[PDB]
Amino acid sequence: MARSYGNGVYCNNKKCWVNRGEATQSIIGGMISGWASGLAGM
Amino acid sequence: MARSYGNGVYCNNKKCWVNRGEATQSIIGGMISGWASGLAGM
Amino acid sequence: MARSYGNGVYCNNKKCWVNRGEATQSIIGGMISGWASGLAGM
Amino acid sequence: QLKLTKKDRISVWLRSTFLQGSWNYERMQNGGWAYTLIPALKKLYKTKEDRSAALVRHMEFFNTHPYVAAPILGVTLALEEERANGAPIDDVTIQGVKVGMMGPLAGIGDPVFWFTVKPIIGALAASLAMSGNILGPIIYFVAWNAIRMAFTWYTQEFGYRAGSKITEDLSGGILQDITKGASILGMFILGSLVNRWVSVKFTPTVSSVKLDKGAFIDWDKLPSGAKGIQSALQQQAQGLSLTDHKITTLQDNLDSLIPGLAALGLTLFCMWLLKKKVSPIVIILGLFVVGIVFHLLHLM
Amino acid sequence: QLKLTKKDRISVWLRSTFLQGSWNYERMQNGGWAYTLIPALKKLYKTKEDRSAALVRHMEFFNTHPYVAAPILGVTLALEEERANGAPIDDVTIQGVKVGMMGPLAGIGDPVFWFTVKPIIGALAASLAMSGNILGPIIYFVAWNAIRMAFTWYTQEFGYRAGSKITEDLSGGILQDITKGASILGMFILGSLVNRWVSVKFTPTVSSVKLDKGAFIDWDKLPSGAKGIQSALQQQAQGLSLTDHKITTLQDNLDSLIPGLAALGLTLFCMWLLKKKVSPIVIILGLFVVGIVFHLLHLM
Amino acid sequence: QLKLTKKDRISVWLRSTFLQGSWNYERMQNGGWAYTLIPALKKLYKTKEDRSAALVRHMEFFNTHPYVAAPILGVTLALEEERANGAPIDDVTIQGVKVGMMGPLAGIGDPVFWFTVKPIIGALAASLAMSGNILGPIIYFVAWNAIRMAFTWYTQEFGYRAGSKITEDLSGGILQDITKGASILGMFILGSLVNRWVSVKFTPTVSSVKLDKGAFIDWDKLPSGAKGIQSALQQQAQGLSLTDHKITTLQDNLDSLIPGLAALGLTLFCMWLLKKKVSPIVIILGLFVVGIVFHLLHLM
Amino acid sequence: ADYKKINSILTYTSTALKNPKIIKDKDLVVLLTIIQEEAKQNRIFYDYKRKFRPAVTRFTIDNNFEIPDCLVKLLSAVETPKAWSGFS
Amino acid sequence: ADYKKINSILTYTSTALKNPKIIKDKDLVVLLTIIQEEAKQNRIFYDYKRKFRPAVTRFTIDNNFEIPDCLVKLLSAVETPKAWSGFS
Amino acid sequence: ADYKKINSILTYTSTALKNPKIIKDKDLVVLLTIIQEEAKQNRIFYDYKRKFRPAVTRFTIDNNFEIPDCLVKLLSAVETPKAWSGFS
Amino acid sequence: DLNFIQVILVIFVAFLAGVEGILDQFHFHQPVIACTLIGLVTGNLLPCLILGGTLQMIALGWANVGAAVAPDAALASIASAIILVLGGQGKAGVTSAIAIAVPLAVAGLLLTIIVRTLATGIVHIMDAAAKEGNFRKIEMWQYIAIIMQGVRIAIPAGLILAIGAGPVKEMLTAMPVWLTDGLAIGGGMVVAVGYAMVINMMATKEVWPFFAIGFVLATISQLTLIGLGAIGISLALIYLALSKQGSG
Amino acid sequence: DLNFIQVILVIFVAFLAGVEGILDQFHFHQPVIACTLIGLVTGNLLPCLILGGTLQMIALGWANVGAAVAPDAALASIASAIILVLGGQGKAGVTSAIAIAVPLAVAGLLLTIIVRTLATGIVHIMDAAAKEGNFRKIEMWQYIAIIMQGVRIAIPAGLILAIGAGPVKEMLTAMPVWLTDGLAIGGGMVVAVGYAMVINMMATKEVWPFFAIGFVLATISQLTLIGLGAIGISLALIYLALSKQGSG
Amino acid sequence: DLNFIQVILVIFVAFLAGVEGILDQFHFHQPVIACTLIGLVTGNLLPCLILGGTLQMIALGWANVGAAVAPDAALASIASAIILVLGGQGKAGVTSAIAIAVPLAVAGLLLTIIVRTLATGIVHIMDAAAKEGNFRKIEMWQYIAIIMQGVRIAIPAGLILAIGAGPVKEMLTAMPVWLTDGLAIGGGMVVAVGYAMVINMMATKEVWPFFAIGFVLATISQLTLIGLGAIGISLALIYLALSKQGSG
């Protein structure tokens, strides 16, 4: 009933909302992996 | 009311059956330890 | 409604009692901390 | 003699916004880099051979994060101003200082600006914007641009004022430790994300066996009033079921081995596919159609 | 000269079924190994002393997994045919190639066939049989035997066609790595099985303190109808006790220390007892009686 | 000649209870140490210069756990008896053996007596005392005093009889390894205790979003009798919120990052302030007042 | 592929392998030998593991932030996949 | 323990300790000293840790898969507990 | 603080830094140098990390359980925080 | 409807997002800024604003790294927000358009690479400009390589406006439910491609075991991403200290 | 009842299970097979097949390793099947026989070792047979040395058929509840012996810490056995690479 | 009320508690022993025993380490017991006395530190006695220091008994809820200072990673503290075994 679109926002059939918890984890998870991979790239 | 007999089969007072999940986990642990048992032996 | 005074005893407004599990955890953690600190301090 | 003024440094600042202007794949940012250098090289050299010598030089392979190139831009302008007035610099130090800087400044630039600063600012603007707030976009354009022009301008002056006397003290004794330690975190943290952030779930059910007496609650003998709920929580607390059927799905069968097992298989398969010279646009276009078909066949 | 035909190789293969025929503890599979070699040695050596020399030779200590003995069987047949026709081999290579092969091939045979292949076939075949299905036992005999005869026959011919040119490249640089890495996993994985697969569960209760007000759900003031359940889960969710008594059993007191504490003692005690020259049939028979007593006194 | 009788040893025993009599911070336990040795210094030396030499010698810095000083007491008594009877011991072996013994015995005594046996005896006595049994304090005093007196007397006798032949086999090649393993274990366990025993919890609420249909159970359409509880439990198990409002507290916002984040922050701040020469009495009083205020401001 | 590219890559790789300083970078030699070998077959090496460019910086920093002509002209001899998806 | 077995084991291990090749494997030299002593005490060694047999393979493989007579005749000197329970 | 204490600490650190056996102890050399420096500035060193006394024990044990006069008289030259809270 | 001032005004923003989609400097192609500009110039402001807020969340982590190009948020924002205005359904159609932004985000990824490949021809022309030392010749052609990236988004926008509200509402009503549902499922699998190319750049026999532990430790749901990273740093700190002592 | 055609056929199947119980080649001793043949000849087929399916699960991991002997599934299968046939209660008596199949599986462990010890003397006869070069004296005894392994199973079966259907029904009704209940509890304590033998062969001061972590890591229910294995190998891979640096 | 025999006995018990606070030999200063003695001499025995058990549970881990000294359980116990007897409310004032103990414990810590700082003059007079070689002055001044450490707690007890039951009952009834609540919360934050001090004594660049691992592993609530210690020992042993190879 709720199609996942990532970063805390899935959708509904008439309204889409962002989940703060999943938004906060995505804001952090990308930071950790982005920093490491960017460093491992050099 | 149900006495454990291992590998997913316990029993009842008139009929015994299999727990598939614990049957699956039994094969996994036997596989992993058995591989190392022969290997560490040699 | 219950004020944590640590080591298992919190209180109430007319009665104070010890949580035995928390007393056990505190005694074991104190044992570990004292042993490690005494061993490292030397 | 051929000193570079404050004015020409600002024109170099304005043109650096186009540092990604051409962006071919052969030499990525040569056009934007060479375009940025014209206001200096116009005055630095005046012969046709000398103007040709500079333009052939800076057309070579250059690529980095466009904000972190300003310290390169300062040191490059430091070298050519010294070169124009007389200094034995010839095609080895001009490229060498640049190439020593494009790589490592990108790997410190890509995390800071792309994957850390942008999402942190982006979330604030989005959270406001989703709430019908016009102040969302206005903050985002202000925040990102105020941050950007301060760093891109100030450090460009710093690269010019410090010469190439900051690149000598950049020995790679630390650098061979930083990337290697980075890989440990990365392979670790991507491991955790693979188990989590790769959405692969299977719907279809396998077995729907029928439970015996003593397994399910059997909502027929429950007491009526202030004691029916009592026995409902305690029987569930002992492991009794809310229906007389145990529903088992393929996801549990995979999950019984390890969680995220189907995500790893896709993750390994993508690893295998890229090594096999498959353009990721085909794989991702394929990865969308797979979601179309597997959902149609009631699989995902 | 003294060549061995296809037919004689088959009887050696047919005879290897009895490779465990004698199974004395002094020499484990010598009788079955020596019996397996009769059709070859009869066709190889004709003198009485030569037959005695071969028979004293192969009565010595031999043991491995009876399926992976065929590559040894072929290499043994490779050496004997070379030896019978004239080759300076003197009782040092004959036992040497065998003893170099019995050990390490068991450590690969025992996992592959005993603890991996046999139960995967067995668990699949049992699942049918428990359902009253005659397809179960028939498949199991077919599955295990079809796997067996091809493997034990094919590798017998490979050992003969490859001789002592396989063990030469079997150096101990790798062998030391495998077992030590095996021991890290083994001590790890037996650690996890010990915490789980060893059932030492204690029944008796210790403390039954009577809870005060605000601790339990108090099923007297609960609302009646479409609001009784709501406050039941909310009182449940905040930790209020489903009954007016808190029961603390012996298993809780050990579990509050660490899970699986009673299981670690037993296996270590079995470790200690087995070190103390106690034959495990005494330990296991004693363990069964312990279960009889500790259940009688309501301990387990 | 100047042999020490049993009476003087018993007097040293009785005087050792006051080993912490002075307890200044400059020289820690020199007062009680020198007081315990007054009978020895009386009975050993009789000249005015020699008594002054011994007293000046034994007013120097001494500290350890007061119970485990008895082996030091014995070795010191043996060394001084040798010094009195004639032996080239000159202010270097007295102090040397003393200071060699102070450290490791304190590090082995602080765990055994303070943080291992004292709290268990105290917990037993406290449970007994709160249970209304007067036997608690009686058992506590009896047990602790018996343990102390037996340990002190026996250890003093051993230290006297053993001479300085125990510390010679006390090379420092292994105390480094013990200390390093101790530091690893202690840092791990102190991280765990920081996360689990320091409670810094915030009360105030942040977000109270109003949920749509299908999110909460909506106790209006629930069935009446022997099926309402069923549907309530199924909707609870599927994750439907038990109320039409979702409560998000600042503690949840911090916990979404990592549990114990505020506790780690306070731990870091205490480390930093102690490094910055702040007397821990001031820090603890300030912590009490901080708790007072933050509870007044409805924060904690 | 393009015949003017392959020959010049074979020129620059053959030039790079004789400079005394590049051979010291044994890691760089592996890249050049494969790059020359692929160019020896009219194919352009596929750098899906983006290793060549980080190494050219590692060697350059190891050589007092100085670079020759052959390494610079070979920087455009690589493919370096170009279809990012992100971290999300 | 049999009296003909004890003397034979004391015979075989004795000749094992004098071969140059068996001496080099220090793992086996520690083993064989144990084999003599309990044979010297009229008892048959109880290696609940199955160490002796794997070492014979370890030594044999190190000697180009060659074995002498003394190690082979000692293969039956072990007890090797025999009441398996399984892994379940 | 105390001027006599500062002068005596300076003297004792000075004579400690001239004994060969103490000179060998680099870990103790660090503490002695730092303590002499702080005495040179008329302050009494504060060690929230109780490092000096365990180090004097380490050195004494490394010197056949023998100690000189300067380390003994400097044993009282440290602050060593005194407001324990416990482990609880 | 859209009058002649608006139909051109949407083109001006549409070209600039393509202009800014490669420049990455003033960030007009971001969903929160791009969607906001289309809604402002068309009169349907708030529905475009919230879509911009909604889409900016999905497009948080899209950033070009090296030669890799992010899923072209310039097309996903500009072209999706136009269908939001033409198709009607201001606040009701925030959901409808968002569903087709991601496939459009992919569709831009195809077009950016085709443009980024034609930019190879210009530098081949531009290399000649280096052979004669012309400062004018390089400037003019650079404006071309900058203009072409803008029309890379204005051309798709031209057809979506050429295909007016008539057929646009028909397509948003003739949408099967499953075409929506499976596209969302495919969207949550695409991140497996990005990880693999990142893992391929970092995986070695030394660090493969660190992947397995982190994968398995992700199965304990009480741990957070920060906590998993803290475990990630600590093994890296321990491994390096243990390896330098061993090697020297 | 059992006729004379069955009693011969019953013992022979039991004899072959003993014959195959040591050969470990054609797998007639397995519970799915061995139970099935007893049910086929006695007419009570399906109850035996279900028992064979049930018992195979308890005996999935029983395999001889080196000198160690598995708990003799040949006796447990034969004795339970005859218990199930003689005493009646086809499907109702599936549980009752299974309860006594495990203890008799141990009873064969006693019997198999006594047999495997008398098999020493035959080879002592056989050693002199090598001293004369007698091929036939070698073959004859090996057939003999196989026969008593079948006899070890056919003799209890001969006594179990000697004790006819009368007393076997009496004992199966005279089984106390606790005699059943305690035996299962003892059954789940057996694997402490098997682990102890394996841990003794593998435990060293260098690998004891790896035991403790694996024990402690087993206390998190979200980890499965496979996940715990991946963690174990990852330390094993890391430990090998780290110790090779230090040693060389 | 309290008569002259009772007040003298109370005062001497308080003095002995003050002596044992630093003597740490007979441990009269413990809450159970001290509260028991005070209740016995005041006639209100059982409330004092219960209170002492409660504080002993509170004060299990208070032990002076090195120069660091615990918050003086002797004064806390003595003052709580005297509050409990004078204020009335035998079993009702248990909670109030327990609440008042902790700040009183901190006050006793301050008093004992002041006394230990004043003891330097005594140590200097003993240095002079060593310079003149007098045993008697040493004994006299040691007795004198023991006497002041006893009076360190006999004095607050004397002043509290000087303040009659009236005002102490008034102060017990005039206690705002928030004062006690915030005091409990502040007491629940104290152990941060001690943990920080121990870490400062232990923290190095080689051990901060292990701190992080342990801290993050503490978030899995199924793991017990014994299990966490086992994990810590295992990591320590693996690290030492690897680093010993690293050194050579």
Ligand SMILES: OC[C@H]1O[C@H](O)[C@@H](O)[C@@H](O)[C@@H]1O
């Ligand atoms: O540090 C060890 C030792 O130090 C000081 O002397 C006192 O706090 C003792 O109680 C403690 O045992």
